[PDB]
């Protein structure tokens, strides 16, 4: 039970880091950031299809 709790705390810490990164990505505008072409081709075409987001 303690081992499970440790494993889950490690996962949740990783999730906090990932959520900080996701929030940073969410609040981006042309006035401060420019979207690289690779970002487009990956995240708006390929990966969404793999995830059934459409």
């Amino acid at each position: 039970v303690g081992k499970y709790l440790m494993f889950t705390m490690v996962l949740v810490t990783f999730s906090i880091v990932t959520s900080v990164c996701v929030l940073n990505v969410h609040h981006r505008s042309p006035t401060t950031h420019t979207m690289a072409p690779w970002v487009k081709v990956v995240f708006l075409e390929k990966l969404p299809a793999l995830l059934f987001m459409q």
Partner: peptide, 17 residues
Amino acid sequence: DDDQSVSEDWKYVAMVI
């Protein structure tokens, strides 16, 4: 419109991630 479209693209990227 152009700026709103780019902001919405960034939102969609975050949603995908």
